[PDB]
Write an enzyme that holds these catalytic residues in place. Structure first.
Site, PDB file in Angstrom:
ATOM      1  CG  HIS A  40      -0.511   0.551   2.749  1.00  0.00           C
ATOM      2  ND1 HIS A  40      -0.562  -0.658   3.574  1.00  0.00           N
ATOM      3  CD2 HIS A  40      -0.584   1.337   3.048  1.00  0.00           C
ATOM      4  CE1 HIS A  40      -0.032  -0.212   4.773  1.00  0.00           C
ATOM      5  NE2 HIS A  40       0.135   1.179   4.293  1.00  0.00           N
ATOM      6  CB  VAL A  57      17.848  17.643  11.536  1.00  0.00           C
ATOM      7  CG1 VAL A  57      18.840  18.106  12.021  1.00  0.00           C
ATOM      8  CG2 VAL A  57      16.313  18.573  11.719  1.00  0.00           C
ATOM      9  CG  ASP A  84      -0.132  -3.895   2.634  1.00  0.00           C
ATOM     10  OD1 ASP A  84       0.471  -3.637   1.808  1.00  0.00           O
ATOM     11  OD2 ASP A  84      -0.144  -3.321   3.836  1.00  0.00           O
ATOM     12  N   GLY A 175       1.497   6.585   8.817  1.00  0.00           N
ATOM     13  CA  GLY A 175       2.851   7.090   8.544  1.00  0.00           C
ATOM     14  C   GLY A 175       3.967   6.466   9.245  1.00  0.00           C
ATOM     15  CB  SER A 177       2.268   2.920   5.842  1.00  0.00           C
ATOM     16  OG  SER A 177       0.670   2.992   6.069  1.00  0.00           O
ATOM     17  N   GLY A 178       4.470   0.399   6.339  1.00  0.00           N
ATOM     18  CA  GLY A 178       5.585  -0.345   6.135  1.00  0.00           C
ATOM     19  C   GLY A 178       6.588  -1.198   6.673  1.00  0.00           C
TER      20      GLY A 178
HETATM   21  N1  LIG Z   1      -3.878   2.208  13.991  1.00  0.00           N
HETATM   22  C1  LIG Z   1      -3.148   1.019  13.372  1.00  0.00           C
HETATM   23  N2  LIG Z   1      -2.195  -0.503  13.883  1.00  0.00           N
HETATM   24  C2  LIG Z   1      -2.571   1.180  11.999  1.00  0.00           C
HETATM   25  C3  LIG Z   1      -3.782   1.752  11.181  1.00  0.00           C
HETATM   26  C4  LIG Z   1      -3.301   2.062  10.030  1.00  0.00           C
HETATM   27  C5  LIG Z   1      -2.764   1.891   9.850  1.00  0.00           C
HETATM   28  C6  LIG Z   1      -1.981   2.588   8.119  1.00  0.00           C
HETATM   29  N3  LIG Z   1      -3.128   1.813   7.327  1.00  0.00           N
HETATM   30  C7  LIG Z   1      -3.957   2.249   6.106  1.00  0.00           C
HETATM   31  O1  LIG Z   1      -4.755   2.730   6.397  1.00  0.00           O
HETATM   32  C8  LIG Z   1      -4.587   0.687   5.066  1.00  0.00           C
HETATM   33  C9  LIG Z   1      -3.996   1.664   3.961  1.00  0.00           C
HETATM   34  C10 LIG Z   1      -4.580   2.135   3.241  1.00  0.00           C
HETATM   35  C11 LIG Z   1      -5.979   1.573   3.680  1.00  0.00           C
HETATM   36  N4  LIG Z   1      -5.791   1.122   4.783  1.00  0.00           N
HETATM   37  C12 LIG Z   1      -6.579   1.120   5.809  1.00  0.00           C
HETATM   38  O2  LIG Z   1      -6.730   1.082   6.780  1.00  0.00           O
HETATM   39  C13 LIG Z   1      -8.071   0.351   5.349  1.00  0.00           C
HETATM   40  N5  LIG Z   1      -9.308  -0.083   5.617  1.00  0.00           N
HETATM   41  C14 LIG Z   1      -9.136  -2.051   5.170  1.00  0.00           C
HETATM   42  C15 LIG Z   1      -8.976  -2.548   6.399  1.00  0.00           C
HETATM   43  C16 LIG Z   1      -9.167  -4.352   5.322  1.00  0.00           C
HETATM   44  C17 LIG Z   1      -8.332  -3.652   4.827  1.00  0.00           C
HETATM   45  C18 LIG Z   1      -7.669  -2.309   4.346  1.00  0.00           C
HETATM   46  C19 LIG Z   1      -0.921   1.724   9.684  1.00  0.00           C
HETATM   47  C20 LIG Z   1      -1.271   1.190  11.412  1.00  0.00           C
HETATM   48 CA   LIG Z   2      17.917  12.955   8.738  1.00  0.00          CA
END
Ligand SMILES: N=C(N)c1ccc(CNC(=O)[C@@H]2CCCN2C(=O)CNC2CCCC2)cc1
Ligand SMILES: [Ca+2]
Length: 223
Positions: A40, A57, A84, A175, A177-178
Site C-alpha cells: 500500500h 534534519v 500487503d 505514517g 505504514s510499511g
Molecule cells: N492502528 C494501526 N495499527 C494502524 C492503522 C492504519 C495504518 C495505515 N494503513 C492504512 O490506513 C491502510 C492502507 C490504505 C487503506 N488502509 C486501511 O486501513 C483501510 N482499511 C481496510 C481494512 C481491511 C483492508 C483495508 C497503520 C497502522
Molecule cells: Ca536526518
C-alpha cells in the site's frame, strides 16, 4: 507510533524512510540493495533514506538512494490488504555500517505472545494529529489469531497477524505504514492496517512476513 518512546538515533538501523518529497512510509533494509515495505506504500519516484533519526534534519549518518525498481506482491489486493508487501531495489548498493544495517528474514513464524519492536515516524496521537520528527519505538506482543479475528471479523487472513494491546493506548498509526515489526531478531511483520490508532479492542494488523520469505528470496535473486 502512539504510546511509545524515542528510540534514540540509529538504534534501529534497519529502519528506512520512503521519501517522495516528504516521508510517506517506513521500510526495512534486508540487504545492501533491497528494502521490504507494504504494498500500500507503492508509488513511483521513491527515494530510500537510510540511517535516519530526525527526518527533517541532516545529522550526518544518512544515505539517500533512489529506487531502481519496485515489485508489489503478485497477489496484493488493495481492498482487503491481503498480501500487503512489496520489495524495492536501490539504484546503488547501500554502504552497510553500524547505523545502516540489514534485518534478518525469519526461518519460521513467531508465536502469539512473543514480544516485538515496532518503530516509525508516524502519528503519535490516538485522537488528532502530531508527527514526531525523530524515530519512535514500541514494544508490543503478538496477539492470538482469535482475538485478532474477533476484533475484525471476516477481515483477517492467514497472511496477517495482530499485535499490541487490546486495552488501547499503544499502537502504530498512519505514517508508520510499511515499517518493521521485529521479534527475536527477525522481521516478522510489516505495519499494514487497523481501525483508528491505539483504540480499545482494535489492535494493529501486520503483514505476516514469514509466509513470504520464499517469494522474497526468489524475487531478489531474479532481479
Ligand atoms: N492502528 C494501526 N495499527 C494502524 C492503522 C492504519 C495504518 C495505515 N494503513 C492504512 O490506513 C491502510 C492502507 C490504505 C487503506 N488502509 C486501511 O486501513 C483501510 N482499511 C481496510 C481494512 C481491511 C483492508 C483495508 C497503520 C497502522
Ligand atoms: Ca536526518
Amino acid at each position: 507510533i502512539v504510546g511509545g518512546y524515542t528510540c534514540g538515533a540509529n538504534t534501529v538501523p534497519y529502519q528506512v524512510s520512503l521519501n517522495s518529497g516528504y516521508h510517506f512510509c517506513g521500510g526495512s533494509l534486508i540487504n545492501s540493495q533491497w528494502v521490504v515495505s507494504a504494498a500500500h506504500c507503492y508509488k513511483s519516484g521513491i527515494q530510500v533514506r537510510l540511517g535516519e533519526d530526525n527526518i527533517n534534519v541532516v545529522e550526518g549518518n544518512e544515505q539517500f538512494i533512489s529506487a531502481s525498481k519496485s515489485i508489489v506482491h503478485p497477489s496484493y489486493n488493495s481492498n482487503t490488504l491481503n498480501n500487503d508487501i512489496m520489495l524495492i531495489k536501490l539504484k546503488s548498493a547501500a554502504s552497510l555500517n553500524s547505523r545502516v544495517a540489514s534485518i534478518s528474514l525469519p526461518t519460521s513464524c513467531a508465536s502469539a505472545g512473543t514480544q516485538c519492536l515496532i518503530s516509525g515516524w508516524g502519528n503519535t496521537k490516538s485522537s488528532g494529529t502530531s508527527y514526531p520528527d525523530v524515530l519512535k519505538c514500541l514494544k508490543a506482543p503478538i496477539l492470538s489469531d482469535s482475538s485478532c479475528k474477533s476484533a475484525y471479523p471476516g477481515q483477517i487472513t492467514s497472511n496477517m497477524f495482530c499485535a499490541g494491546y487490546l486495552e488501547g493506548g499503544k499502537d502504530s498509526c498512519q505514517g508508520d505504514s510499511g515499517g518493521p515489526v521485529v521479534c527475536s531478531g527477525k522481521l516478522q511483520g510489516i505495519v499494514s492496517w487497523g481501525s483508528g490508532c491505539a483504540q480499545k479492542n482494535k489492535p494493529g494488523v501486520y503483514t505476516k512476513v514469514c509466509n513470504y520469505v520464499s517469494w522474497i528470496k526468489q524475487t531478489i535473486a531474479s532481479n
